[PDB]
Amino acid sequence: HHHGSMLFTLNDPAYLKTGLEPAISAKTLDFHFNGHHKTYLNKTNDLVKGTSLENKSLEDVILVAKTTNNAALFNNATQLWNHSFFWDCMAPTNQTGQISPELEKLIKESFGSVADFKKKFTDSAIANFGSGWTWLVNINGKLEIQNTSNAESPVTLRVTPLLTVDVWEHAYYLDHQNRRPEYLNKWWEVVNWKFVDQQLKQ
Amino acid sequence: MLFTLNDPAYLKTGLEPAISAKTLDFHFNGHHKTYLNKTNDLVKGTSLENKSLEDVILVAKTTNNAALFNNATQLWNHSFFWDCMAPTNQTGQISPELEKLIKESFGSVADFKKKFTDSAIANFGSGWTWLVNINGKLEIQNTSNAESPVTLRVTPLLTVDVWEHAYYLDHQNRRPEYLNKWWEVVNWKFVDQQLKQ
Amino acid sequence: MLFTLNDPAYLKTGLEPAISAKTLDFHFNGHHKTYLNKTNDLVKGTSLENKSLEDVILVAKTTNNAALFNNATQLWNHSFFWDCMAPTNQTGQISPELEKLIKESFGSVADFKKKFTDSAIANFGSGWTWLVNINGKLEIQNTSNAESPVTLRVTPLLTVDVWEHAYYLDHQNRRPEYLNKWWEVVNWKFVDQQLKQ
Amino acid sequence: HHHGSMLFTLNDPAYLKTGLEPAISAKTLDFHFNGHHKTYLNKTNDLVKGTSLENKSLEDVILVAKTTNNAALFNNATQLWNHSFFWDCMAPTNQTGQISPELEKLIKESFGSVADFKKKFTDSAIANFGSGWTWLVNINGKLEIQNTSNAESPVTLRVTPLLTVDVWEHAYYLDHQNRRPEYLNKWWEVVNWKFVDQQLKQ
Ligand SMILES: [Fe+2]
Ligand SMILES: [Fe+2]
Ligand SMILES: [Fe+2]
Ligand SMILES: [Fe+2]
Questions:
Q1: CB distance from C28 to chain B under 8 Å?
Q2: Looking at chain A, which subunits does it touch, using at least 3 CB pairs closer than 8 Å as the criterion?
Q3: Which of A122, A137, B52, D130 has CB atoms 3.0–4.6 Å from A150's, for a disulfide?
């Protein structure tokens, strides 16, 4: 069938060892990336080998898992994608850039103001019960805030994800314990707005 | 501009032996127009006015709006469903490209039909059974109630409706008999056109 | 020993104008007996032999056994459904006890019926709409597919089946008209007995 | 209308300050009980007061939330109950007691052996994806293992809960981070078997 075996791989986030203070500590990123993310990577790779999914791209694996209702594969493959997306969403504070004019317009149009968007994104992330994610998605020029639970993700949907925050407790418990609002508040300072704008141009 | 529907071409003729014109009257003039009315009502006076149905569906899904998602997606599902069928003498045939991908994912066309049929039979409650194209690999997907691959980064090729209203008047609980007769009204040229858009 | 059903006393007469004898023919002899045989098939050769249907349902629910849960609970749901109805001349009345709890919980019987009815209309897809007693406080519950309060620490008082097969032959897409006329067959004697013991 | 208003309350677990080493540290119990459990208690009391659920038992409030699909009420009220049950399920390693011959009888029958039960329960709890709980329940004399998600709980069901472990990440992340198997491994050493026996015989 093939003799060109491939697996998924992960590269260190550039800020892995220095951290994302004051939002996310270097300690948290160690357990988050070397623990959770690599666990999802190894499990996705184990479940796909020796099957018709070997060598398929991660997004094809995610959509096959979703359409065939394969829970174990969906949970690991989509968690593998969500964290890779999550790392691009953030940067050390001095390297975040700013909201582009074009992106600022669509935030105003969909939410009134940038300040209002942040509060509604934050309140939505706080209200997201249990493990999951809160997303900013672009629907053909209209922006929306989406909550998902556990590994569910808009990567499966006909939308463009612009931004996500992880509210699984492992994303913040070492630094913030039960104070998720304090986690989300400081997380705004590490949002990589250069990436959000680049996601908008596609 | 409100969303609108046009009668399926075979509305008065029916799709015997799968679906009678009687059933099509209730299915289109009842259920499908009901979904159309609710959708227009839910969108009227909102920021969703003058947006496509697909945008309306994805807005409903991403914002977890059940009432809007259920009616707008059901509105899309039936329009796709009607396009998937034709009277037995106007079905066309499975294209060489499509047979090729069917054989790849399921071995043979006969095997595909079998598994597709078993999947629709196993689909408990209300819902739909779909054939989708995932970047060159075909898959059979069951969805519940109004759920639909129209939300997903996949291409739907074919669907059969297994809500009981799609078949109860002609077949009552004989859903297997509905599905196997349903194969005779599959609009294969539509399926092939979905593969090559 | 394996589970059994006995014919509803009114199987040949129907519940006109709510449910015809024909609908009852497919509803009982088709679906309900199908759920019975599959429940019987799944518990045969297993540790569930000898256990009551309720134990089987709770075992299926706690172990996430979908096939066993769907069949066994639908098997219970339909039995409870039949006892909830009677021919229009044999429905009995709302007792003073139940009437007090209805207006305590819902304001008036008129507001209750409207809201129970509005609830069943809103119960999207296949499912059931229930009146339940929670230690003296009553509530309206919507469930999907085979889901049921029989698993819960509540006492069920009344249910209407809104699977489309429950009503499609008599009312097709007119679920409100099925519910409107379903009220005339509510075995209000039975609902009051559920309120005791 | 009456003149004896009531509220839900919590008492400190007896081991709150000593901890449950090596399974759960005193620091975790501080955030878990004083943080999470008390937050669930105040939200439950705040949601019911001034309503027709005021002065109703915790179990009645839960079934009303569940039957009427009241998400905010169900999540807080049921989590209030889940943790209270969880604290009774545990005791310091020197005060756990032993499995009674009658409880041992039902375990062997439903699971083959006590060794096989612990593995199944542990494997079930490791596979419980996201936030949730893993339970041992008695169904009219037959025992079963149940996984639930987020706040879901057999307190809603016509069964007797015998034992639960909390697998929300806040239950273990400060002591064990992503090593949930190691948390569950040590958690067996703090299981209060005499509480499990009392649940069976009541
Ligand atoms: Fe994470
Ligand atoms: Fe339909
Ligand atoms: Fe039914
Ligand atoms: Fe907890």
A1: no
A2: B, D
A3: D130
